[PDB]
Design a binder for this molecule. Structure first.
Ligand SMILES: Cc1ncc(COP(=O)(O)O)c(/C=N/[C@@](C)(CO)C(=O)O)c1O
Ligand SMILES: Cc1ncc(COP(=O)(O)O)c(CN)c1O
Lengths: 352, 352
């Protein structure tokens, strides 16, 4: 089953094999040093700035998302929405009483900085939340510009980097980000179960909220910074993430962005040749190709057909449920060979 | 490094090797089949009653602990405390504004049902919380007795079964338990990263509190009962957990208890002969051997000495910090070969 879902992603033998290494306690100095190494690799990708909290939470990307909200002392929070996942952010903010304010943009269209700027003048915000690459629509948002605006309005900048960290240009310092996170199974090509996070110094000062125990970043810091006991960690996953991080760094994000952009380009031409149409109206996300099937072809049915043909892709989600095919070009998904196989399966699927 | 910490525990080869199976999407029909398989096995160990919610949360035992509290509509909650982990239960209950009422018992001593009976007559509790086996003290609490008292009081019965599920006789129905949980790395001897949970129909009816997103059991239910999307799951851990669950059912809980109790008695005599003394004053937990060191020997120093000899054990925690050694007799920890090596390393350590 070729894995072309825009998360989880294919795992390199080298990484998955790391899960075979001898099991150890979560407080074993060796594991503590493995955790130290992980922080250093993640810092090279995150570029978080001194005094920042860098860790890998024991959960999926969503845990990382909620941790960046549940610990916030207060709202209001300007949630920039243009997709299913920024919608999830607003959903979590509301749940936690951060009195979120939604600034909506049409699915398939990028968030507009000019619009953001005007919204920031209307009220004072403690935090502004954005999703770097909106997986549900295949849209890349202008985070660097947004971050500059947030800093001007004196608001913390929360950024979902699931579809970008490890594959596209990323830097918290450069984008003025106060909180970033991803999942171990995204562009990092590691097995799912961990959620790398990064909280700047200013984020930590504002993170005095106490609404959850498991996701309390203060408790998390005690283990990741001081080696104290918070809760038992998925040690084996830690092994795999460290190995996965070395792999990413050996290649370098520049080369990884090229892989994605190149394949994205010809796959779209191949799909347009077959009647498909790109979903994003502008500012496409290189790591996730989202397309509408040919007229008269049911997207979800096509996903089921592709599965039967040996290839797993994703259907739409949130605003695009039942309307598209979402193709992963994150990590090992972004491979010429993988997509040539996908096209063979697609043709078999379309013939039925 | 021989892993004899009372959690995590050594992992069977058959179990760890399952982590090498082909990665799949969290919604892949094959994975959903594995999940239903997981539920079947856990229901066999939990014996939760009809309509109960059974699942494996993506997180450590602590996530399972908080999940049964953060989802509770209202308190007050009578938290029976006699160890570090029942104290954690109290800390979570407070955070979530469930008005916890703590009833303390001396560390090293089991909770007394008669004292609980009186407390339950002093006030009407929405829930009664207990730790089946307190890992910090090596004490086994009278879960069955307390559950009968809870049912009479009309209170939901919350039970931490981390050191008991998968090794000691257990049944939510027989014990009147409404919420039970454990971790994958405990008696199940699987890789850490998952937290098996079981909520009774009555717990589900009362679980209408919305305080956390990730740990919302209603959302978890949507994925584990209807195959819907909640968040990406640790797919490889799921593969491993199921394999570990089968290993448990193939041996049988009755036989696993016997295995643990047999080693407990033998190791304890060997340790007494060497000047060690049992920490529990009554009702010793067969799955966790807690001992005080010989005269003149420091507990934490001995733990480091053992590590230097290639053996990993835990020192005290919470109320027993620096006063004891805690040896794991859970899952693969309960093996003669393992503890014979322990004694060899121990005598080398004691010689210095
Ligand atoms: C932008 C974005 N943020 C957060 C998440 C949450 O991560 P996790 O909890 O699923 O680990 C996803 C996952 N989106 C997936 C890959 C999974 O449903 C998809 O279907 O787009 C995502 O695309
Ligand atoms: C009795 C008890 N309860 C809960 C837990 C929580 O598990 P974890 O460390 O896997 O979060 C533990 C293990 N620390 C425990 O021993």
């Amino acid at each position: 089953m070729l894995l072309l879902t825009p998360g989880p992603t294919p795992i390199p033998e080298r990484v998955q094999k790391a899960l075979l290494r001898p099991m150890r306690g979560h407080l074993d100095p060796e594991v503590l040093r493995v955790n130290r190494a992980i922080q250093e690799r993640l810092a090279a990708l995150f570029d978080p700035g001194e005094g920042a909290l860098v860790a890998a939470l024991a959960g999926s990307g969503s845990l990382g998302m909620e941790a960046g909200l549940a610990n916030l002392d207060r709202g209001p929070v300007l949630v920039l929405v243009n997709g299913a996942f920024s919608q999830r952010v607003a959903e979590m903010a509301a749940l936690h009483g951060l009195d979120p304010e939604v600034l909506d943009f049409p699915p398939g269209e990028p968030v507009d900085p000019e619009a953001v700027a005007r919204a920031l003048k209307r009220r004072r915000y403690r935090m502004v939340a954005l999703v770097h690459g909106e997986t549900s629509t295949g849209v890349l948002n202008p985070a660097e510009a947004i971050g500059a605006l947030a800093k001007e309005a004196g608001a913390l900048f929360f950024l979902d980097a699931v579809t970008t960290l490890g594959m596209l240009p990323f830097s918290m310092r450069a984008m003025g980000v106060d909180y970033a996170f991803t999942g171990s199974q995204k562009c990092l090509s590691a097995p799912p179960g961990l959620a790398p996070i990064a909280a700047s110094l200013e984020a930590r000062k504002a993170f005095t909220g106490k609404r959850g125990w498991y996701l309390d970043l203060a408790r998390v810091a005690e283990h990741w910074e001081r080696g104290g006991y918070h809760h038992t960690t998925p040690v084996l996953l830690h092994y795999a993430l460290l190995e996965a991080l070395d792999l990413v760094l050996e290649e370098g994000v520049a080369a990884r962005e090229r892989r994605a952009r190149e394949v994205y380009a010809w796959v779209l031409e191949e799909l347009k040749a077959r009647g498909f149409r790109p979903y994003p109206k502008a500012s496409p996300l290189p790591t996730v190709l989202v397309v509408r099937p040919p007229e008269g072809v049911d997207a979800d049915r096509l996903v089921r057909a592709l599965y039967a043909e040996g290839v797993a892709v994703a259907g739409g989600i949130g605003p695009t449920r039942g309307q598209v095919l979402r193709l992963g070009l994150m990590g090992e998904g972004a491979r010429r060979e993988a997509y040539q196989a996908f096209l063979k399966a697609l043709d078999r699927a379309l013939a039925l």
